[PDB]
Amino acid sequence: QIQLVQSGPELKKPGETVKISCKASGYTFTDYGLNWVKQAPGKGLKWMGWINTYSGEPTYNDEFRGRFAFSLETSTITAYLKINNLKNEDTATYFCARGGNWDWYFDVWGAGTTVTVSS
Amino acid sequence: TNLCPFDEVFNATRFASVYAWNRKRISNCVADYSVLYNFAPFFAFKCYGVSPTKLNDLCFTNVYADSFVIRGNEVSQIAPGQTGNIADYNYKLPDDFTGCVIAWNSNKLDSKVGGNYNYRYRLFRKSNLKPFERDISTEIYQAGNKPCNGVAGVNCYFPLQSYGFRPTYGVGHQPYRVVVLSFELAPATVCG
Amino acid sequence: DIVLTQSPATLSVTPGDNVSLSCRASQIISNNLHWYQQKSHESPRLLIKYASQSISGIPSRFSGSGSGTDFTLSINSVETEDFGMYFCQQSNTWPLTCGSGTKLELN
Ligand SMILES: *[C@@H]1O[C@H](CO[C@@H]2O[C@@H](C)[C@@H](O)[C@@H](O)[C@@H]2O)[C@@H](O[C@@H]2O[C@H](CO)[C@@H](O[C@@H]3O[C@H](CO)[C@@H](O)[C@H](O)[C@@H]3O)[C@H](O)[C@H]2NC(C)=O)[C@H](O)[C@H]1NC(C)=O
Numbered sequence: 553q554i555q556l557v558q559s560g561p562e563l564k565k566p567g568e569t570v571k572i573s574c575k576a577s578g579y580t581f582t583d584y585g586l587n588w589v590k591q592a593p594g595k596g597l598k599w600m601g602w603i604n605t606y607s608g609e610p611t612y613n614d615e616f617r618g619r620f621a622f623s624l625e626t627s628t629i630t631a632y633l634k635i636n637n638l639k640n641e642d643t644a645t646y647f648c649a650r651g652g653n654w655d656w657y658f659d660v661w662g663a664g665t666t667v668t669v670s671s
Numbered sequence: 672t673n674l675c676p677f678d679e680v681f682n683a684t685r686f687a688s689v690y691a692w693n694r695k696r697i698s699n700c701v702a703d704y705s706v707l708y709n710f711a712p713f714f715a716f717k718c719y720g721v722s723p724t725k726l727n728d729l730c731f732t733n734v735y736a737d738s739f740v741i742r743g744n745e746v747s748q749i750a751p752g753q754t755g756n757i758a759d760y761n762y763k764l765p766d767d768f769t770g771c772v773i774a775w776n777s778n779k780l781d782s783k784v785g786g787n788y789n790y791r792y793r794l795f796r797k798s799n800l801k802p803f804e805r806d807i808s809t810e811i812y813q814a815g816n817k818p819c820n821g822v823a824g825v826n827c828y829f830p831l832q833s834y835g836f837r838p839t840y841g842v843g844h845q846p847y848r849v850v851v852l853s854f855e856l857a858p859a860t861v862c863g
Numbered sequence: 864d865i866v867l868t869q870s871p872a873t874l875s876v877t878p879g880d881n882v883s884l885s886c887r888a889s890q891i892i893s894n895n896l897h898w899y900q901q902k903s904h905e906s907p908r909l910l911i912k913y914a915s916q917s918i919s920g921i922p923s924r925f926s927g928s929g930s931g932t933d934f935t936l937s938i939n940s941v942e943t944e945d946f947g948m949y950f951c952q953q954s955n956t957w958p959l960t961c962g963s964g965t966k967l968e969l970n
Contacts, residue, residue, distance in 0.1 A: 582784050587959075597907070597950060597961040604779050606838055611779070613958045647906060653783055656684065656954045657897045659918075661906035679890065682957040 554578040556648055556662040563668055564638055572665050574648035575630040582606050586631050587651040587658060588622070592644040602651060603631065635667075643668045675700025675861065677707065680736050686848050688790045689739035689761045690831060691807050697734045702861045703727075707773075714776050714847070719751055720769035720854070727863040733855035734770075737762070740781060740790050742834065743843040746774050749851060758800075760793040762851075765802035770853035778838060778845040787836035790846065794832050803853075865890050867951050867962035874967045876941055883937035884927075886951035886962050894930045899950035899961070907950060911936070943969055 559573045574586065588600035601613040601622065608624035623632040631648065645666045649658035675697050687693045704727055707713070716723060741749075741757055748758045751768040758764070781787065795812035811819060811827050819827040836846045869886045876882045886896065896914040901907035910925050911917050914934050917926065927936030938945065946969060952961040 596963045597952070599959040599961070601958070606784055607779065609779055653780070654685075654787075654789065655912070656959065657909060657912050658899075658907075658952070659909045661908070664906055679956055684895070684954055684957065 554660050556650065556660065558646075558648060558662045558665040561666040561668075563670060565671060566638055566640055566669055568638055570635050570638065570667060572633040572646060572667070573630050574633065574662055575628075576650065577629060579650075581626075581629045583653075584650050585653045587649050587656075588633060589647040589649060589658070589661075590616075590642075590644050591647070600646075604653070605631070638667075638669050640669060672701055673699075675702055677702065677704075677736075680738060680850065681707070683738075686738050686740050688792070689741050689757065690791060690793045691805055692737045692739045692762050695736045695738075697736060698860055700861050701863065702731075702734070703863060712775065713773055715746070715774040716771065717750070717773075718771040720856075721771075723771070726771075730859035730862045731854040732857055732859045732861065734861060735851075735853045737851040737853070738849070740777070740834075740846045740848055741792070743776075743841070743845050743847050746847045746849065749849055756794075757792065760796050760800060760806075762805070763800050763802050764851070764853075768853065769856055770851065773850045773852070775848040776842075776845070777848045781846045781848075782836050782838040784838060787846075788833040790836060791831040791833045793830055795828055795830050864958065864960055865892065865953055865956055866960070867896075867953060869949075869951065869962045869965045872963075872965055874965065875970050876967065877970055878941060878943045880941055881937065881939035882941060882967075883935050884949055884965065884967075886934050886936070888932045888934070888953060890956070891932055892953050892955035895955040896934050896951055896953050898925075898927055898936050899952060900947050901950060901964075902947040910949075941967075 555578055556574055556576045562570055564570055582605055584605065585602045586605055587602045590598050590600055599613055600616050601611050603610045603622040603624055610622040612620060619636050621634040623634060633646065645664045647662050647664050649661040651658045680695050745757050748755045749772050751764050751766055811821060812830050813827050816826045823829050834846065866889050867886050894914050897912050898910045899907045900910050909918055910921060911927055914927055914929060924940055925938055929935045946967060948964045948966045950961045950964045952959065
C-alpha cells in the first residue's frame with residue numbers, strides 16, 4: 553500500500569493563510585523526496601519545488617520564492633504547505649507527488665487538494 | 672549576443688561521477704559571470720591565473736567546463752600540483768592552469784540515509800593520469816601474481832570503489848560538487 | 864526554464880487506430896523526458912520513464928521513442944478508455960517543468 557492522502561478542499565478570503573497537509577505512509581518516507589505541483593484550471597502543471605524528507609530544507613522554484621513555505625514534521629509522517637497572503641490569482645488544485653532523490657519522476661501522486669479564494 | 676550554457680552545467684540534475692568527468696565545450700557566446708556572482712553558496716570560487724574581479728570584461732577562447740562529485744575532504748585536490756588519490760587517478764590539472772575551480776555543498780541533494788553507492792572513483796591504476804584525460808576502463812588491477820581475468824578475490828581488486836554519501840557523515844565527507852572552468856588564453860570568441 | 868511545446872493541441876481519433884503524440888524540447892536534454900497521463904479530474908499517472916522505458920503495471924500498448932530534442936509517444940490500437948490529457952515532464956535542468964499538455968478526445 554502506497555498513498556499520500558491530503559487535506560480536503562478549502563475556501564478562503566484574499567489575505568488569509570492556509571496550511572495543506574500531505575500525509576505519506578506505506579513506504580519508508582526517508583528513501584524519497586517530495587515534490588509539489590500546482591495546476592490552475594485550464595493550463596499545465598507547474599513544479600513548485602521539492603523538500604528533502606530527511607532534513608526538511610526546501611528548494612523553492614524561482615517563481616514561487618516568497619509566500620510559500622514547505623514546513624516538515626517527522627514525528628508524524630506528514631509534509632506541509634503553507635501560503636501567506638492569498639491573492640486573487642492562485643485558485644488551483646495542489647498535488648504532492650513522491651519524486652525520487654536520484655530519478656525525479658512523479659510516480660505516486662496524491663488525491664489533489666483544491667484551494668479557491670472568494671470575497 | 673546569445674548567452675552560453677552556464678545554466679545547463681551549473682543548475683543541472685545529475686553530475687556524473689568523477690572517474691568519467693563530463694566535459695562541455697563552450698564557444699561562440701557572451702559569457703556573463705555576473706549570474707554566478709549573485710549565487711552566494713559557492714564554497715570555494717578559487718581562480719588560478721586570473722582574478723575574479725577582472726574576469727568579466729576579458730575575452731577568453733576555447734573555454735571548457737568539467738564537472739563531477741567528490742568527497743568533502745578531497746575537494747582540496749582539484750588545483751595545480753596537488754597530490755593524492757583524485758588528482759593521481761581521476762582528474763589532474765596541469766601546472767600552467769589558467770581557469771577556475773568552483774565548489775558546492777551538495778548534501779541536500781546527493782545524500783540518502785540508505786547507502787548512496789551510486790557515485791564512484793578510481794582506486795588503482797598502473798600509472799598516474801596525464802593532465803585532462805579520463806580512464807573509464809573497468810577491469811581488474813593486480814600485481815603480476817596470477818591473472819584472474821575478471822574475478823575478484825585474493826590479490827585481485829575491482830578498481831572503482833564507491834562513496835558512501837550519507838547525510839550523517841560530516842562536513843568533510845558529504846559529497847561536494849565541482850565545476851572546473853579552464854580557459855585557453857588566435858581570435859577571441861567569448862566575452863562579457 | 865526549458866519550455867516544451869506539445870503538438871498538436873487538439874486531436875481526433877477513433878478506437879482501434881494508431882496515433883503518435885509529440886513533445887519537442889527547446890534545449891538538448893539527454894533523453895531525460897517522462898510522459899504523463901491525466902484523465903478527467905484525477906491525479907495524473909506515470910506512463911513511461913526516460914521516454915523509452917516502460918512502467919510495470921501499464922498496458923502493453925503505450926510505447927514512445929526519440930532521443931535528443933525530438934520525442935514521440937505513439938499509442939497504437941487506441942481504446943476509447945485511453946482518453947485524457949498527456950503531459951511531458953523533463954528532468955535534465957532546473958527547475959523541472961512540464962509541457963502545456965494536449966488532449967486526446969474522440970469523434
Ligand atoms: C540556475 O537557475 C537558478 C534559478 O533556479 C532556482 O535555483 C536553482 C538552484 C534550483 O533550486 C531551481 O529549482 C530554482 O528554480 C538561477 O538563479 C536565479 O537567477 C535569476 C536570474 O534572472 C534570478 O532572477 C533575478 O532575481 C532578482 C531578485 O533576486 C531580480 O531582481 C532580477 O530581476 C531577476 O528576476 C533568480 O532570483 C535566481 N534564483 C535564485 C534562487 O538564486 C541560477 O542563476 C541558474 N544558474 C545559472 C548559472 O544559470
